[PDB]
Amino acid sequence: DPQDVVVRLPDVAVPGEAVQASARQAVIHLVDIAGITSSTPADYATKNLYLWNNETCDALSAPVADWNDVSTTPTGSDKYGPYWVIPLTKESGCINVIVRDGTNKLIDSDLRVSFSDFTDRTVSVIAGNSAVYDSRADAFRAAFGVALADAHWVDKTTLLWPGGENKPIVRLYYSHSSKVAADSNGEFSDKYVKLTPTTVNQQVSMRFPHLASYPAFKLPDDVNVDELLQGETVAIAAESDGILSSATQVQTAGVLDDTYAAAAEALSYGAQLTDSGVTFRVWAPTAQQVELVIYSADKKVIASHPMTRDSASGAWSWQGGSDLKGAFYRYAMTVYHPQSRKVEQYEVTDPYAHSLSTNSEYSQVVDLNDSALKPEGWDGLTMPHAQKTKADLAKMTIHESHIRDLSAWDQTVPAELRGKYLALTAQESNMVQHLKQLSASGVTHIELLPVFDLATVNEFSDKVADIQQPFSRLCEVNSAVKSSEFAGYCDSGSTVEEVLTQLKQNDSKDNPQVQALNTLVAQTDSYNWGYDPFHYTVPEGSYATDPEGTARIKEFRTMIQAIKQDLGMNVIMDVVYNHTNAAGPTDRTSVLDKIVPWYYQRLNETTGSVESATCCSDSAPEHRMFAKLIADSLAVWTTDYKIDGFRFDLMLYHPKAQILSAWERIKALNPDIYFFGEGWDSNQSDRFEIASQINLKGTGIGTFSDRLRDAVRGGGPFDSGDALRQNQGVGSGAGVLPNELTTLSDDQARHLADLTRLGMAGNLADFVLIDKDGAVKRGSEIDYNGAPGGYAADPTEVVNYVSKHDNQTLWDMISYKAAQEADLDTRVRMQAVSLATVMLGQGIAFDQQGSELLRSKSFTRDSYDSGDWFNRVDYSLQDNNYNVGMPRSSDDGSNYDIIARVKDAVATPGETELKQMTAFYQELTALRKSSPLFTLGDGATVMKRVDFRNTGADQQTGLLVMTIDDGMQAGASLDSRVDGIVVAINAAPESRTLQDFAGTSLQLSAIQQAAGDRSLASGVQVAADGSVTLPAWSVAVLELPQGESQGAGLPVSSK
């Protein structure tokens, strides 16, 4: 433009160091940005440092310990500001600094100047900035160069940025090929688009509520966003004299959606078999170039095809021969990445990959419909359990499982199928026969921990050593062991398993040697939960016998087929769309963020950094093209792999609307698909309505309930130390069998029982019960740590559980909490009593694999990387993996003392207890499915039929008494054998007698009668007059038999 100002640096040299510290000295410069804008020489007499020694930093020699002393004035100064020479007692360590003008802080942050990061002890700072810089030049270019990324190009014409508020020059500079910066003289010569102040739209406000308080700026209606977005984009502000105010990078995901998403959403992505051949398509609306690289089976480039860019969508496409089926491929990108600030060139696998090479290095063209990739009969495979009505869904009884947890240890699984999808076909193995038994008794669904492509297992078998293999193999592949306390064992000729067993002997809270070795094993074994997504829509390769190419696809479907057809269970998949394993332009597992940088990840609105609140690299499902990729992904798992439902990890990091959108999309494919998820944190309500327990009321989207879970288990997931033992649950005898440490009051115990009863009636917000004080309360009025307790509209929106893959197993919680006088048999009943609140409740029942086997992880709280050793499940029923070493010290170190106290209170369960627990478990699940009354499905039907006795301040503590009405009132006899059901769970050491049903013709269920001495109700007595005496630690299911007509049943009372 002819006129208008040239934005430029301050006309002054980039400063050097004023002085350098000598011995026993440190030096601090204050780079006076405002006085570098010159005119008069500023005066620095009022500048002073406050300097003091504490315990973290003690290197100062003459620190003044009086805040009102402003005498530590600059040693000298020049045009760039003052500096201080600080005497020291030493040259290592650190010093504490506060920079002041008088007693006012110019930097409102205690400065830790550590001579480790700063070898020459000569640092610089700027006012209003907590950063400690290496040199005055660095600090100067921080102030007068591009920093952060707080500008937000949110649609075509709207740009939000605080740094340009009320300032004369505000513009959007850009360079196709290089990083915007001042030129040889000192001016910003690059092209720009001028910005005018404006007011945020109602659509920008609705779209980005967490930004609607940013100062808004308008772009020319004719601006060419295609060209701007090709390279680095940098918003700049400047004074009247053209001096640079601030300059920041731009986040563009808003405008990318405004510009391209409408067109890009109508397209299909990945390597797609058609009639004419194969269409490749990838979305890369900012890339300068995309070439499709075709690879031979041995990974030699055999063709390279520049792709065609569609300017409306920003998608790139290429069409080739149908002979490309089976070919490996990547996308060679030429694309600017805001994090590196450079135009990167790298090859990336397809985010829409549906097949992969070993370890996910290349994607592969595949037609998932090929009969070659299907087990015989696949096309006719049906769901063994219905999921159509709410009553169908309430029957769901989930068994949460992991591919290695299932088979890694089962000697009766062929050695080569161990830890593999195909282990589920080993029809005579202990593991599969055990699962068949569980299914026959009423476990209806297997939920699989991550079986999409995860990043954290090396699928090259030659770089892996598992504990069943020689210890010398572990030394080969894990160079770290050779320099470790176990190095002597490389010669042993014994397996790692055999070694770890020997380490149990001397293992203790002082000598945690089992865990010490296992930490090394964990680095290079085959084991991980897998919450670490590499590709969302390919199976994991390490669980295939052959991870190269398409074999894993047929092996996966063969597993799926055996579960439905041979075990008789539906399959749920854990999915993890809330984060990616990595982001940025360099990491091997950064896929989405290499192709469309800063679009698929959720970013800090100020720094532009990829957030990590999930654990890892947070994703952005509020962005339209990630929403599409999620829905497309689930479509494949639904249709091509016949997955019956999905559990979303950290679902509350997703918009409610996005999750409902994905659900309507998938229901168009199969109406019976069930969606549910877990969540507690997020802190994303500022950006959108999150998909949380509270917000999902009425949607039919299920959520894990932590209410009954914590009431029955006791305590909470963040307890540590003695609190693990004091915070007894209903299942472990809160109030009624106190241990030596607890101070649980009767009121507290009765509070837990309110939460438990609420959960057994499906945790509905509007269920009305009598609370711990005899007060009438709606479910939402029962407190849960501040939140409303009951939150749902139907029991099918609530997933009850008392054990899960994450946090301590149920058995380990009982071991922490059970009084010394509870013997081994009483603790087994505690496990069953605990599980009974889930299995006999109206919420969907969920449980961890092996709870029927008293599963233990040796007190490990978080076993995601704790290997075969601590996650062992022994389907030969020799033990429950209890007491196999102290858990990992890095996470449970603070628990070693309480563990040592409690650990050896009773014997370790052996085969007798394991068989007894399993019978108890099957008894519970056979009861759950013995009557429609347990699984009403609909929350209004729950309210009209479900009540509780033994409530109020004078209840018998720990006795849970639920009634389910099948009588003349409420409605019709959904159950032709009974007019009502009584569920009684006597979680207490005393025998108890019920009088609430005197004269009523009550009788024990046939299932519990059949089990005889093995029943949870063994010893129950029903007297002639209908009074019922319940043993200690018992579970009893009673029914009023039904006559030629429908009896009066157990009418609910209007409270």
Ligand SMILES: OC[C@H]1O[C@H](O[C@H]2[C@H](O)[C@@H](O)[C@@H](O[C@H]3[C@H](O)[C@@H](O)[C@@H](O[C@H]4[C@H](O)[C@@H](O)[C@@H](O)O[C@@H]4CO)O[C@@H]3CO)O[C@@H]2CO)[C@H](O)[C@@H](O)[C@@H]1O
């Ligand atoms: O070597 C001693 C300590 O020196 C430094 O502490 C400084 C602070 O940085 C100054 O800000 C100030 O502290 C004020 C404080 O800001 C003021 O609010 C008030 O503190 C209140 C406090 O708000 C309130 O929560 C409650 O605790 O009452 C306090 C007073 O009892 O008063 C303070 C005194 O001026 O001055 C101190 C000087 O000691 C340095 O930051 C420390 O790390 C260091 O240990």
Ligand SMILES: [Ca+2]
């Ligand atoms: Ca230096």
Ligand SMILES: [Ca+2]
């Ligand atoms: Ca993998």
Ligand SMILES: [Ca+2]
């Ligand atoms: Ca591992």
Ligand SMILES: [Ca+2]
């Ligand atoms: Ca935020």
Ligand SMILES: [Ca+2]
């Ligand atoms: Ca009936």
